[model samples]
Every structure is written in structure tokens, then in C-alpha cells.
Target: NRTDLEMFLKKTPLMVLEEAAKAVYQKTPTWGTVELPEGFEMTLILNEITVKGQATSKKAARQKAAVEYLRKVVEKGKHEIFFIPGTTKEEALSNIDQISDKAEE
Candidate 1:
């Protein structure tokens, strides 16, 4: 039998994204990027290139920059909450229903 703890701890990717989006809405400076694990599809969008900008091909350097950026944000106690990909706005609003349903259990 499932316990209340188990049900409450069940986290979906969409839910994770939802919280992340909320964090962002609270004036947190965060850039949302998805890093897919194995067996997941990664979508890349290419914006039009500007002639004056140079592209960096060093993956390691780019990763380092990303880590630094995240560290700064975290150290400042700022976070960007975002809904997981494919989550609808309505699902996020269901937070009220979620609370009520959990309270009954």
C-alpha cells in the first residue's frame, strides 16, 4: 500500500518545471535550459547569427561558464522556476486542487 509520504514525494518532470517557472517569476535571473539524459530527445533551436558575434566551440569552456552562472545565482539566493517542457498553464494552476487532494489523504 502507498503511504502519504510516497504520494507526496512523487515528482514528475512537468512538476519540476512548474516550480522552476515560479522561481523565475519571483524576479530570479535564470536561464532555463534542458539537459537530457540518455534515451531522451534533445531539441535545439538556432537563432539567426549576427555577423559581429563569435561562436565558441569549446564544450568544456561553455559548461564551465554555465556552472559559474548557476553558482552566482544560487549564492545570491535567486532561482528561476519554470514548468517542465510540455506542461500546460492549467496544470500549473491545479496547485489548488493538488493541495486539497493531498489534504484529504
Candidate 2:
């Protein structure tokens, strides 16, 4: 049950995040938007969620914005943080389990 919950919490945000990204792609004529002085602002609207990202490049900004939105979703699931390193999947899952456990308390 714990493992099931862990997988559920981990994958649920990712699934929604992917759906939001797909919606952005389908709705937009082109990827990314107009450029700003500081950088570019990438905005994506999916249903009620509005996510924005800023970076030196348009593509980077879009990706950053999507990731930011995903992070927020994950955080809302009671997962405190998300870190991805060049590590094994098992290790990553273990780390997430530890973090989730700590957050629950």
C-alpha cells in the first residue's frame, strides 16, 4: 500500500504536467512567444493553471516554465522537493520515499 501510494504520488503530478504540456503544444501555433529585454517569457495555460517561465532563450524558457509548473504540482502532492541526478531509478525512488516520509511528519 505504501509503495502504491508512493508511486501514485510520484506519477500523478507527472501525468498532469505532461497533459498540460501537450495541451500547450496543441493550442500554440509555435513554441515559445515574444522576447523580452531581460529574456523570453514562456506562458502556457491549461484549464485553470497558468505557468510562466523566463530565460535567455525562448526554448529554454518554455522548458523551465513547464518544469516549474510540474514542481508546483508535485509540491502540492505533499512532496517537498524534486531532484533529478544521474542516478539509478531505484535510488531515486528510495530518495523520494525518504523525502515523502519526512514531509508527512
Candidate 3:
């Protein structure tokens, strides 16, 4: 599974980046250049999904962002969507049903 994303956080910032680099997303997850500040910060953008990380260095900043990213996947998966963005729930529900019906054949 994508448990590697969660496990990477415990390893190294390098490890996290390795998984993140290959991981695909609908919106294309990204590690921002720098959201620098008093403590040095960064941003991870993936959807209703963005996280900030602060540390002494940008590399470390990424770890926190990746950590947040994993939880975003692990916890919310962002509210556990049943339909995609820009799709109305009423139509989407039937679309979901339609897709399954094809497989039932």
C-alpha cells in the first residue's frame, strides 16, 4: 500500500521525497520552493490538501509537510470522497452505480 508514505516520515527527509516523487495524484502533489520564515517553512500542495512544515532547513521542512501529507491520506483522504470534484453528488452517485454495473457484466 501507500503505507510507505507514512513509514517514510520515520526514516529521512530523503526517504519521504523518494516516495512523494513517484506518487501520483489527481492534482499533482508538490513541495513548494519555500514558505520561509522565522523558523524556516515550506508548503505541500495536493488539494483541499496543503500542509506547512517548519524547521532549520528546507529539507527538514519537507518532512513535516510530508508527514502532514500522509495524515491527509491516512486520516481524511479528504473526507473520503465518493465523487470527484466539479461533479454534483446526485449525478455522481448514479455515475458510480453505472460504473459498477459495467463490471457486474
Candidate 4:
């Protein structure tokens, strides 16, 4: 069970997106009886990319999905995009402004 990711997703879907890409998480249960417990599935999205995960419970499915999503972002090196160290918040904002302007050139 990935209760950690459950709280993590809640406390900061925004933080996760800010640190890397806009990753979103969701889990859906199979249409099985409550006593039977068929299985669970997960849908994970990072920007335009989507991934699915399968498991026997929502927690497990979410854990699987989170791992895969983490792997994908690492492979894409999205984690490296936010390392600029500015002395002040205003400087960082203006720095990003210049970066974006140059990016369009």
C-alpha cells in the first residue's frame, strides 16, 4: 500500500508538477463484488504522456504507477530543469523571464 504517495499526491500535486512535469495520478477499481475484489488500475499522466498500472488494490496500483511515473521523468531528465539558484525571488522570476524570452528566439 502506497499511503505515502496518497498523502503525497494530496499535499502537493502542485509541488510534484513544479519540481518536474505536470504529473497527475488516479486509480480505478474493477467492477468486481466487494467480497471478491477483482483488481485495481491506475492512470498516470505527465504533461502529454500517459501511463497505466495494474495491481490487486488501489494502493498497490498507485505505487506501481508512481514508480513508473518517476522512472519516466528521470529518463526524460525533467528533474534537471529547475536548478537555477538566485539570491532573491524577484531575481529568479526575472531570470526565468529572460530565459523564456531567449527560448522563443
The top-ranked prediction according to lDDT is 3
lDDT of 3 by residue, 1-105 (tens): 245565424234334334444454433356666544577777777645678877887656765676566556535433233122225545534533333344334
Q: List runs of model 2 lying over 4 Å from the truth.
A: 1-32, 78-105
Model 3: CA > 4 A from native: 1-28, 35-37, 77-105
Better of 1 and 2 by lDDT: 2
Q: For model 2, where is the 10-residue window of minimal lDDT?
A: 77-86
Worst 10 residues of 1 by lDDT: 45-54
For candidate 4, the per-residue lDDT at 3 reads 49
Query: Which regions of candidate 1 are displaced past 4 Å?
Result: 1-57, 81-105
List lDDT for all candidates, in order: 0.32, 0.49, 0.50, 0.45
lDDT of 1: 0.32
lDDT of 4 by residue, 1-105 (tens): 124564333342223334444123332222221223546667766554466777887655655564455445445644333243346756544643443344324
Global Cα lDDT for candidate 2: 0.49
Model 3 whole-model lDDT (C-alpha atoms): 0.50
- Per-residue lDDT of model 2, residues 1-105, tens digit only: 124564455443333344344444443222347578877788765444567877887546765665555445444542222233215645544553443344334
In model 4, which runs have C-alpha deviations exceeding 4 angstroms?
A: 1-38, 81-105
List pairs with backbone clashes in candidate 4. none
Which candidate would rank higher by lDDT, 1 or 3? 3
